[PDB]
């Protein structure tokens, strides 16, 4: 019985592998023959935001491309006015271990998650004042690796218990639980249409989920180590994954296969955070060698090096308008690059 | 005008800077510790994470117990790299080999190669009664224990036969073999034996943290 089911599973795996191989006419390298090179990018630190006492584990941008939420292990959620290097809000956190922070698309809310297994949403705009907890979303068995707002009264969370969840904030109860990963989910990137979200786990696999139906449509398996960061390509049905194998890869949601492998002989350090530019031409990846990296997505070749951090580059985000890169790192400093 | 908004931003930033200065003092006052391997140590010290506070000689220590998570540790243990020490409790009675590889992984982890590990040998009386029995998990799963002699420097710890001493220090040197190899003053693995009837564990962690901070001072004060 069990052996028969395992044989059926092997047959199905071979079937999907054969289908993918048939659909594998070429790779993303097929366009790396005629596209003009992007040229050497040279972005300097346009500001260093020095308010954090510990490693900046995660950070996020607001839709205004001006405000900046940054999280660190001292127990702070600082909102930075990147234009004038001013700390608009300093939100103390109940639990100092925070691995993610999110900014609501319409402002007014900030969500932080970490080892506490809880996602807490803070009311930035307040009739009274004193930005405080609005809803303390609990229910995840393990820690929280990434929280992504989609609007008020809805949040999508990825946890280390191999499950992703969509929460209704006002009621405080889960709406849909996503299951199918066998490892700790690390990163979550919602689609621009905000109807799908991909997640990378510690089982060398990434899965596309439908936020409404609640099941996994496609499972992507191309890596040989834990996926540490994931990020949707702006739009075009693609996403990029950075792993601990010192390799970045680009997956297409429609072809259901990997397309590129951003790796080099020199690099042996994993990618902690991954992000994309507005055009999607540049893929920016933060490594463990205390140095961020710039990748031409269409032409796998490297085209930039954002050195300037003395420790692990933990988080890395690109503005919605595409005007800046705010790279947090364990050096307790956050730098904005043009 | 925009000058009013600029003044408002300056005032808000001034308040945040004062608050962050106070928080800077607080953060440099308290020391963070990670406990790996027990609730008994938490009981004698006085939810995905358990935050517990204690003070000895007016110094602030924070210990963190990962007590509602999975068995996978390769990702959430990286967050505990700025901690002063990683307290490691072992049964020290194959539990022991699994403990040895957990310790080895912590020692050889890229982000824990600056963090010393206060090994404690959480239980010792079970080891005493095991070697009294003889056929328990002392000699069968570790043949070299029979072919090993108690080192001279080992304190007798009165109240026990030489067999208890040799088995105890055998597990201690089994844990110290990984510690000595591929390890320098960056992290030292202070070895200790745990007494559940006494509160010396807090004092010993205090002394180890004192030595750790003294080493970081020697390094940052260029006394080397």
């Amino acid at each position, epitope marked *: 019985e069990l052996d028969q089911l*395992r044989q059926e599973a092997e047959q199905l795996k071979n079937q999907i592998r054969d289908a993918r191989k048939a659909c594998a006419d070429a790779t993303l390298s097929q366009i790396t023959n005629n596209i003009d090179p992007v040229g050497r990018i040279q972005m300097r630190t346009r500001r260093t935001l020095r308010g954090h006492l510990a490693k900046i584990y995660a950070m996020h941008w607001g839709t205004d491309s001006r405000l900046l939420v940054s999280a660190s292990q001292d127990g702070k959620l600082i909102i930075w006015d990147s234009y004038t290097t001013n700390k608009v809000h300093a939100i103390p956190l109940r639990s100092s271990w925070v691995m993610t922070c999110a900014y609501a698309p319409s402002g007014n809310y900030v969500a932080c998650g970490g080892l506490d297994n809880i996602c807490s949403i803070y009311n930035l705009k307040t009739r009274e004042g004193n930005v405080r907890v609005s809803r303390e979303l609990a229910g995840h068995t393990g820690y929280l690796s990434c929280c992504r707002f989609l609007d008020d009264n809805q949040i999508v969370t990825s946890s280390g218990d*191999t499950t992703c969840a969509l929460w209704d904030i006002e009621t405080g109860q889960q709406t849909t639980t996503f299951t199918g990963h*066998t*490892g700790d989910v690390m990163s979550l990137s919602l689609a621009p249409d905000t109807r799908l979200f991909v997640s990378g786990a*510690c*089982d*060398a*696999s990434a899965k596309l989920w439908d936020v409404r139906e609640g099941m996994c449509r496609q499972t992507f*398996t*191309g890596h*040989e*180590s*834990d996926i540490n960061a994931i990020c949707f390509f702006p739009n075009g049905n693609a996403f990029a994954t950075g792993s*601990d*194998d*010192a390799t970045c890869r680009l997956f297409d949601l429609r072809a259901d296969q990997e397309l590129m492998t951003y790796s080099h002989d020199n690099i*042996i350090c*994993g990618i902690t955070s991954v992000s994309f530019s507005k055009s999607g031409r540049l893929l920016l990846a933060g490594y463990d060698d205390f140095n961020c990296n710039v990748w031409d997505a269409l032409k796998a070749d490297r085209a930039g090096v954002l050195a300037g951090h003395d420790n692990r580059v933990s988080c890395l985000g690109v503005t919605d308008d595409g005007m800046a890169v705010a790279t947090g790192s364990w050096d307790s400093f956050l730098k904005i690059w043009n | 005008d925009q000058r009013n908004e600029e003044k408002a931003q300056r005032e808000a930033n001034k308040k945040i800077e004062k608050q962050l200065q106070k928080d800077k003092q607080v953060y440099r006052a308290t020391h963070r510790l990670l406990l790996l391997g027990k609730n008994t140590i938490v009981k004698q010290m006085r939810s995905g994470i358990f935050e517990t506070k204690f003070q000895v000689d007016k110094v602030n220590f924070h210990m963190f117990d990962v007590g509602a998570q*999975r*068995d*996978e*540790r*390769r990702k959430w*243990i990286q967050c505990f790299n700025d901690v002063t020490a990683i307290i490691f409790v072992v049964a020290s009675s*194959n539990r022991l*080999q*699994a403990a040895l*590889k*957990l310790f*080895d*992984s*912590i*020692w*050889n*982890n*890229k982000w824990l190669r600056d963090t010393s590990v206060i090994l404690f040998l959480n239980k010792q009386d079970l080891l005493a009664e095991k070697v009294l029995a003889g056929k328990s998990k002392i000699e*069968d*799963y*570790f*043949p*070299e224990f029979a072919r090993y002699t108690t080192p001279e420097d080992a304190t007798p710890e009165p109240g026990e036969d030489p067999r208890v001493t040799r088995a105890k220090y055998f597990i201690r040197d089994e844990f110290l073999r990984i510690s000595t190899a*591929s390890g320098d003053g960056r992290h030292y693995c202070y070895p200790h034996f745990t007494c559940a009837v006494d509160t010396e564990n807090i004092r010993r962690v205090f002394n180890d943290c004192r030595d750790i901070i003294q080493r970081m001072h020697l390094r940052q004060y260029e006394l080397l």
Partner: nanobody
Amino acid sequence: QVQLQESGGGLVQPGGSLRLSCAASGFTFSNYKMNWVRQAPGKGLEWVSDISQSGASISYTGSVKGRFTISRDNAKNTLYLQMNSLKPEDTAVYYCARCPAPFTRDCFDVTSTTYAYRGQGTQVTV
């Protein structure tokens, strides 16, 4: 995907000998500290052996000390194990486990019940 397909085993009387290899088709096989872990009937996963990237660094536990050999043939992408002087101790599903990350010498988790790269073990009844 990362595949660890065990082979060999069957049945053998006490004092016999077997061998078992693990084909790998997902990772490099040269920069991972591969190792053997077993679950005896009625017990959890317990460590047996371990070989490093070069193959020079080699470790065992007490029960398998001197009676087990690890080969780590890089060309064949198969981690072998020469089982000698067998006792009823094994009677387990021997499966191979890979290091979580390459270019590291700290296999942090191998004994977890749901670790991603452990394979489907083959029974060795003795």
